[PDB]
């Protein structure tokens, strides 16, 4: 018999992004080919199968620095980190291959799906 | 020129609630008249003006235990903590006064608004 506030999840995500922009309570640095990205472990886990696996590991859960595979493109990661905190994906002709490869590595199934669809339309 | 995934914010919140239910990466205990509630500081801040103020304080941000005012009802807090992680509010005739008072103290404006409206309809 609950009532539901339609905008609650969006408002929560908007506030989490405000915390990220002001570097409030960020608890991890993600290193991508020497570029560094500060974030909240819980948000990374909520968006990515890879971060979910990493931060549920009894040893890795306590790390303050995570280094991604050197093949990962920093711009592709940046675009995906922005998507995690906003639901908005900056998908462009020039970045779609790097975004799809990064989303496959991060295990972000819905992003992989839209990249596959956008690539298929151009062929 | 971004595209947007409609269900992303809801899916993020659902995963954050899964983490709460399994007590994964919870970093604070909220004490309410001896009842204890584990949660994520970032989620509490994203939902409540009071927790936002508390965890942005340079001393309180580092506390692992927060004690609420003794007038706060544990059931009213529990219902609001559930709402924070799900967008669902269990508002009932028997709890509406405790839920509204707790939402006013926690500074959860949209919850206060629906409680005022539901009370006004019964008068």
């Amino acid at each position: 018999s609950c009532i539901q506030f339609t905008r609650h999840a969006s408002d929560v995500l908007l506030n989490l992004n405000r915390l990220r922009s002001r570097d409030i309570l960020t608890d991890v640095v993600i290193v991508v080919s020497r570029e560094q990205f500060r974030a909240h472990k819980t948000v990374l886990m909520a968006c990515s199968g890879l971060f979910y696996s990493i931060f549920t590991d009894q040893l890795k859960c306590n790390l303050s620095v995570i280094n991604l595979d050197p093949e990962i493109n920093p711009e592709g990661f940046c675009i995906l980190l922005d998507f995690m905190y906003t639901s908005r994906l900056n998908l462009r002709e020039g970045n779609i291959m790097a975004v799809m490869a990064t989303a496959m590595y991060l295990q972000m199934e819905h992003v992989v799906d839209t990249c596959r669809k956008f690539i298929k339309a151009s062929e | 020129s971004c595209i947007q995934f409609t269900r992303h914010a809801s899916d993020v919140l659902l995963n954050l609630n899964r983490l709460r239910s399994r007590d994964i990466l919870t970093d604070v205990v909220i004490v309410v008249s001896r009842e204890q509630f584990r949660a994520h500081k970032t989620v509490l801040m994203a939902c409540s003006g009071l927790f936002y103020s508390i965890f942005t304080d340079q001393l309180k941000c580092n506390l692992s235990v927060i004690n609420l005012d003794p007038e706060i009802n544990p059931e009213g807090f529990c219902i609001l903590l559930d709402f924070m992680y799900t967008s669902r509010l269990n508002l009932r005739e028997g709890n509406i006064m405790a839920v509204m008072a707790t939402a006013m103290y926690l500074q959860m404006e949209h919850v206060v608004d629906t409680c005022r409206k539901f009370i006004k309809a019964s008068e």
Binding site: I3, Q4, F5, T6 | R88, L89, H110
Partner: peptide, 4 residues
Amino acid sequence: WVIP
């Protein structure tokens, strides 16, 4: 607010 809605009935979910």
